[PDB]
Amino acid sequence: LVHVASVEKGRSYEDFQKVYNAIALKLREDDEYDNYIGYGPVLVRLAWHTSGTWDKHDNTGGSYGGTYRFKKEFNDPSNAGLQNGFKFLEPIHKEFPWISSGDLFSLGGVTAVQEMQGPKIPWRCGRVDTPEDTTPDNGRLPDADKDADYVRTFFQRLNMNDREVVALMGAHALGKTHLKRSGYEGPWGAANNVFTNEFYLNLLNEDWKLEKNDANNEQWDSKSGYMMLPTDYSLIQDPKYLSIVKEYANDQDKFFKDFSKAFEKLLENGITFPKDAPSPFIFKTLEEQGL
Ligand code: HEM
């Protein structure tokens, strides 16, 4: 099945910059969430999980249809906690009812990365809501208790190569694991609502110990109070991933550029953009606008 991008009727860059801005202003205002981490990280994860159900083999799942709004997908165990990002976006959608669900979930992620001082992420409009029976089944998002071979094979289904995988994983600088959500507990670093290459630096430079958490799952822990999932740690166990981790730990600009490309790609998988579609939009941050 082909999913052709269809611009919300009559809308242009300024309309979407207004949606961006409303997201960004609420991110600033609603600062208490998650012990003052704020909503940035969970909005990035919402964008990824709503895109990451895609299957390149038959074009099922993906960001286009905004199917997270249906109960089979919002109740996926893999999505536990993302309801907080959805609730955040509800007043945004009420103010701007013309935006599609897929466009809003993906734009939330872009806006969060940029407002957290991350790279610019070009973003295209035109996702169209599809019906409840197009919702992908549970089980397409990845397990955390696995090794590098698992990670590499998993991401082939999303058409991501080694560099794209290691770059995307750098988003684990953000937010934290929550025991009641995923069976893992703790942040990956100190700067968890500012977008930096800290994930790679901590992988290489902390002294990690393999411990069991209070849900009886293994995770890697440091004396600084940081953690890594087994799938994170696999990036320094596999020699191909290790090389790339070292590259990003040593070049913040390269990480930013490669993350931006991979994240846009993730958010666009499955979508056909007509030859005469608008060019991708690059939104200004609140700071750049003086707001
Ligand atoms: C092998 C792939 C991956 C696995 C197994 C994985 C697993 C996890 C787990 C278990 C959590 C903690 C959930 C919780 O307890 O709240 C988490 C959080 C998160 N993940 Fe991933 N992840 C992967 C890839 C990614 C990618 C590709 C991105 C986005 C580019 C991403 C962004 C995030 C963010 C931002 C959080 C923090 C959420 C919060 O603080 O609420 N992850 N991930």
Curated annotation (Swiss-Prot):
Its EC number is 1.11.1.5. GO terms for molecular function: cytochrome-c peroxidase activity; heme binding; metal ion binding; peroxidase activity. One of its GO terms (cellular component) is mitochondrion. It catalyses: 2 Fe(II)-[cytochrome c] + H2O2 + 2 H(+) = 2 Fe(III)-[cytochrome c] + 2 H2O. Heme b binds at residue 172. The record marks 45 as: Transition state stabilizer. GO terms for biological process: cellular response to oxidative stress; hydrogen peroxide catabolic process; response to reactive oxygen species. It is found in: Mitochondrion matrix; Mitochondrion intermembrane space. Its main location: mitochondrion. Keywords: Heme, Hydrogen peroxide, Iron, Metal-binding, Mitochondrion, Organic radical, Oxidoreductase, Peroxidase, Phosphoprotein, Transit peptide. Signal peptide: none annotated. The modification Phosphotyrosine is found at residue 150. Binds 1 heme b (iron(II)-protoporphyrin IX) group per subunit. Its cofactor is heme b. Belongs to the peroxidase family. Cytochrome c peroxidase subfamily. Present with 6730 molecules/cell in log phase SD medium. Forms a one-to-one complex with cytochrome c. This is Cytochrome c peroxidase, mitochondrial. It comes from Saccharomyces cerevisiae (strain ATCC 204508 / S288c) (Baker's yeast).
